[PDB]
Design a protein around this ligand. Structure first.
Ligand SMILES: [Mg+2]
Ligand SMILES: [Mg+2]
Ligand SMILES: [Mg+2]
Ligand SMILES: [Mg+2]
Ligand SMILES: [Mg+2]
Ligand SMILES: [Mg+2]
Ligand SMILES: [Mg+2]
Ligand SMILES: [Mg+2]
Ligand SMILES: [Mg+2]
Ligand SMILES: [Mg+2]
Ligand SMILES: [Mg+2]
Ligand SMILES: [Mg+2]
Ligand SMILES: [Mg+2]
Ligand SMILES: [Mg+2]
Lengths: 119, 179, 96, 114, 123, 63, 173
RNA sequence: UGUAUUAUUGUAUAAAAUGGAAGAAGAUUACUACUUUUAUGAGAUGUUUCUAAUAUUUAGGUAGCUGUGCAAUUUGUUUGUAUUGAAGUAUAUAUGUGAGUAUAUAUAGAAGAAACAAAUGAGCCGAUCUUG
RNA sequence: AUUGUAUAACUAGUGGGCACAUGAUUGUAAGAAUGAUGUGCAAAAAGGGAUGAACCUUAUGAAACAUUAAAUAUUCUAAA
């Protein structure tokens, strides 16, 4: 997966967020799939998504953080998040790399500065 | 930043102490550790500068390296002005050159930024092109430039030519004194 | 109870005009920080009728615009754009 | 004109008392939003004043509405000695409520304390 | 009053869809036709030219075909033709065709009075 | 850990509610079996409701 | 709210003063300029002659009457500078130019009226100190201004000559 | 204090045909070199209302292919209008996203409309188009 | 990562192309001629390069409100 992000670096900025910000994403922007249709992510649609194995939203965030055997099924039932433009705008350019002066590329742990303004 | 219009006491560049080593393998577990100090704006910019330096002195590719720990160094400033001498290597159009300058500032973070202001006119290059070797505090009788030796002598007095207006208004009547 | 002002222009681009929002220069306001207090205040503009009687249209301040205290405002029927450099007034009544 | 705020009603209105030509007060109802507050205050208890909605008239925004003068209540004149005594205590208060309020030029409105 | 009249006035427009160049000559009638040329500036839809009809302008089905009184009109030919719309007294209104003579037009108004049907076309 | 999704066969899904033939009796047979096949669990009944809405070519003759 | 303003134009840069006035007209005020022969033009005198000599070369070749005109007077030269900032063709710019008036020196009507100055345009506070410059009316003598001597005498003489309470508090209360 | 190199930078070398182009006025703090903040600004991206085969997913389009609908003349069946005034024509008003439809007033004087099916000589701005 | 995949039947338009980035052959050279990989104009809206088929941001029904990108903040011209 790291080699795939190397080739697609002209459109992608990626990092590694903490636990508290990961908890903030799912409660605001969360859409579940059941029978190939998007739904509201309630406590009842979680039942029909996982056939009764998971009964709460907090069960999902525990499995993405500590990588368990339920990683692939929980990460796939979420559709991609849809975020806003950043409050305050981009600093340099959008085209150049991060170490060059722009925004694209690998932020290692400083991705938590960009996502919270877009959140 | 109350009186000035830019932060001259805490510039964007800081000081970071870095350390790294190679990832362990079967042929070579527990390899050698290294340490240095690079000046940058965050630890991510300082990670990229330090790993390129380790590419040249040794054949260590940065894809196999692992970052151990990076901490920042701050200095309890008193407020006395000191003398500093910086030696560095800059990259220009024709090739590389090495020079030497002497400055006067409060701390070595601040004395570095007085070099970037002088290099914007005499050298005309981006700030990432200068590589700083060392910053040291100079005692007396090592000052090789008359500019530092002229200001180091005690009891200085010189006036100021007044050319700035004291009102941020569009128009004032004639004979009001902008002192 | 009214503070005088000057209708400067509509909300502009270089080559496109948004006809719904208007910019007003209030008297003696020179900053962003002083302009943040004048929000929600009713603005009354005076324009004529067909039988030459007075007619009145009112509007509410929406927000600030720029670094020098210019203020956006939204009316009921928009300004006729030939009334550039005329005088409107600001009331001291807040409307929420 | 500066007007003593007596008591708020339930109709999103207030009760208010303005002075008149000689030692005379009245009652009227206007919105809460039509007002502006100052830091000066006298002490008038709320249980002395009694409220009746039909006695007191109201005033709208528009000027050209004729208002009717209702006959003065007997409870008012007992309250009138409880407020016209209060104007005599503070030095130059009758001259304060006669002078009309004016916005001053060359100074911003939201700077002063009022 | 009827609440449907205030809902009806929310969906109104001024746009008229007049054919291009219909003012320049008297050959071209102002009914709408679509341009199919090569260099046509109206076909590409640049700003400053006329607008074209699209399906996004369509009103909802509650408000469509509604008179300003709040009803939907219907055409009668007889004095006895009012029989199917007796029960729909509040929803529908009736009007008379333009071929009915003046003598037969009198007997329609007396029959619409007893049942309670509201007639628009008078005099 | 996976979950297998249920596969509805395409020979049981219905596409056309109206028959192309101008016969009023065939229309009255067709909507009757559609009304049953929605609330039925048996599979072969759903196959009949699709086969009534096909053409002349797709239901050939049987000896 | 629109004000009337008399401006002393002396000790000002020529181009920068005309920039601030053109926004002051487009909000609907009225303004008058006095002593326009004493504005400053930066640079040496030798370049400023070469710039004006190139302006005197442009004339229409077919019919020179219907061509670019070259005014000489320092009042009418200052009006040509302000016209470049304003959209003088449409109705919006035709109105703002009807509130502008400039003069030569100080006439008789304005001896008692006050004047103002602009602190963003004064030479001591705009530029770096110690460079060469020249005046405006000093330049236009060489191009054919017939009278620069009488205006100097009349203005300088103008610029030389200018260089029972406790009872009423108790009774009214 | 001066002679050698290196880096940055200024001037000369530098000549054309109607009156001229940093976009222009004009600028020496509106030019050039290097940093941090603030604001303006796109069917972009977010929030709410509505239309298209419970669209929280899809919607541009020349050549070209398919579906749902409006206008005209004649034929079979059913229903109805008209000398207190049919068809035509000229001005308004309402209604339809649109081809279009309905009504009102003036003029004129003898026949015309709607629904379920049928037959085509079935819808013009252009062709150095034809006739007046 | 994808809820479908696979298979048949019938039929239209087109066969004069040009430009940008990377790299080449002939030619003194060309807005010259001829090949290779990717994306465009042709057939593609709005905003910016004063103006321009191909340059830079950028996916598509009718509208209103807030946040940015490309580019700019003496004045024409919104913004120290
Ligand atoms: Mg930015
Ligand atoms: Mg690119
Ligand atoms: Mg903004
Ligand atoms: Mg969009
Ligand atoms: Mg948008
Ligand atoms: Mg389409
Ligand atoms: Mg034919
Ligand atoms: Mg014709
Ligand atoms: Mg044609
Ligand atoms: Mg002819
Ligand atoms: Mg072609
Ligand atoms: Mg374009
Ligand atoms: Mg250009
Ligand atoms: Mg401006």
């Amino acid at each position: 997966m790291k080699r795939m992000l190397q080739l697609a670096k002209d459109y992608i900025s990626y990092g590694s967020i903490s636990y508290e910000l990961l908890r903030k994403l799912v409660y605001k922007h969360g859409v579940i799939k059941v029978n190939d249709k998007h739904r509201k992510l309630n406590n009842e649609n979680i039942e029909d998504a996982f056939r009764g194995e998971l009964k709460c939203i907090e069960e999902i965030i525990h499995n993405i953080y500590f990588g368990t055997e339920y990683f692939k099924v929980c990460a796939n039932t979420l559709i991609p998040f849809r975020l806003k433009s950043p409050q305050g705008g981009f600093k340099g350019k959008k085209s150049k790399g991060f170490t060059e002066g722009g925004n694209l590329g690998n932020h290692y742990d400083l991705i938590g500065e960009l996502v919270e303004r877009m959140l | 930043m109350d009186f000035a219009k830019r932060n001259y006491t805490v510039p964007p560049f800081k000081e970071y102490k870095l350390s790294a080593c190679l990832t362990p393998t079967s042929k070579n577990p527990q390899p050698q550790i290294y340490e240095s100090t690079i000046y940058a704006q965050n630890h991510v910019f300082a990670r990229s500068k330090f790993f390129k330096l380790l590419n040249d002195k040794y054949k260590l590719k940065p894809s196999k390296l692992v970052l151990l720990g990076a901490e920042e160094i701050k200095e309890q400033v008193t407020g006395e002005v000191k003398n500093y001498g910086i030696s560095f290597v800059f990259r220009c159009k024709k090739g590389l050159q090495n020079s030497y300058r002497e400055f006067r500032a409060i701390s070595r973070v601040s004395a570095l930024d007085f070099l970037f202001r002088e290099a914007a006119i005499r050298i005309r290059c981006k700030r990432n092109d200068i590589f700083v070797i060392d910053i040291k505090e100079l005692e007396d009788e090592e000052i090789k430039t008359g500019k530092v030796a002229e200001f180091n002598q005690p009891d200085l007095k010189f006036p100021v030519f007044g050319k700035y207006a004291n009102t941020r208004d569009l128009y004032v009547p004639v004979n009001t004194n902008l002192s | 109870m009214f503070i005088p002002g000057i209708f400067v222009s509509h909300r502009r681009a270089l080559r496109r005009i948004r006809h719904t929002q208007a910019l007003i220069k209030i008297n003696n306001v020179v900053n962003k920080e002083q302009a943040k207090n004048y929000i929600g205040h009713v603005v009354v503009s005076k324009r004529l009728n067909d039988d030459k009687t007075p007619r009145d249209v009112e509007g509410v301040v929406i927000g600030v615009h720029g670094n020098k205290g210019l203020v956006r405002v939204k009316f009921e029927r928009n300004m006729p754009a030939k009334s550039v450099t005329n005088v409107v007034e600001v009331r001291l009544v807040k409307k929420e | 004109k500066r007007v003593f705020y007596l008591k708020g009603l339930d109709k999103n209105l207030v009760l208010c008392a303005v002075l008149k030509d000689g030692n005379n007060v009245s009652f009227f109802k206007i919105d809460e939003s039509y007002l502006l507050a100052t830091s000066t205050k006298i002490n008038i208890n709320v249980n002395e004043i009694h409220i009746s909605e039909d006695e007191v008239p109201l005033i709208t925004k528009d000027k050209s509405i004729e208002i009717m003068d209702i006959e003065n209540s007997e409870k008012m004149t007992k309250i009138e000695k409880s407020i016209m005594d209060e104007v005599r205590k503070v030095d130059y208060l009758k001259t304060y409520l006669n002078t009309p309020f004016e916005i001053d030029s060359s100074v911003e409105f939201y700077s002063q304390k009022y | 009053p009827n609440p449907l009249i205030a809902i009806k006035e929310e969906f109104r427009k001024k746009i008229k869809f007049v054919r291009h160049h219909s003012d320049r000559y008297n050959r071209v009638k102002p009914s709408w036709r679509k341009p199919r040329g090569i260099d046509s500036n109206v076909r590409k839809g640049l700003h400053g030219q006329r607008k074209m009809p699209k399906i996004g302008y369509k009103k909802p089905d509650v408000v469509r075909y509604l008179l300003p009184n709040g009803l939907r009109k219907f055409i009668i030919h007889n004095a006895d033709d009012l029989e199917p719309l007796i029960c729909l007294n509040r929803t529908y209104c009736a009007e008379i065709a333009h071929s009915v003579g003046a003598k037969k037009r009198i007997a329609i108004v007396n029959r619409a009075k007893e049942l309670g049907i509201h007639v628009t076309n008078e005099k | 850990i996976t979950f297998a999704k249920k596969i509805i066969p395409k020979s049981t899904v219905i596409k056309r509610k109206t028959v192309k033939s101008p016969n009023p009796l065939l229309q009255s047979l067709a909507d009757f079996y559609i009304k049953v096949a929605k609330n039925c669990s048996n599979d072969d009944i759903k196959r009949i409701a699709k086969r009534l809405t096909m053409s002349n070519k797709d239901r050939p003759v049987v000896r | 709210m629109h004000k009337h303003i008399v401006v002393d134009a002396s000790n000002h840069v020529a181009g920068k003063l005309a920039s601030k006035i053109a926004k002051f007209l487009l909000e609907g005020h009225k303004v008058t300029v006095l002593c326009t022969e004493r504005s400053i033009l930066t640079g040496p005198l030798d370049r400023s002659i070469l710039k004006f000599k190139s302006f005197m070369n442009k004339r229409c070749r077919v019919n020179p009457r219907k061509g670019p005109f070259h005014h000489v007077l320092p009042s009418m030269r200052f009006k040509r500078i302000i016209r470049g900032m304003i959209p003088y063709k449409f109705h919006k710019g035709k109105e703002a130019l009807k509130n502008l008036e400039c003069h030569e020196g100080i006439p008789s009507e304005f001896i008692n009226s006050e004047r103002v100055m602009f602190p963003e345009c004064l030479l001591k506070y705009c530029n770096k100190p110690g460079k060469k410059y020249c005046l405006l009316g000093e330049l236009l003598v060489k191009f054919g201004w017939k009278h620069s001597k009488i205006v100097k005498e009349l203005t300088d003489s103008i610029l030389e000559k200018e260089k029972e309470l406790e009872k009423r508090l108790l009774s009214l209360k």
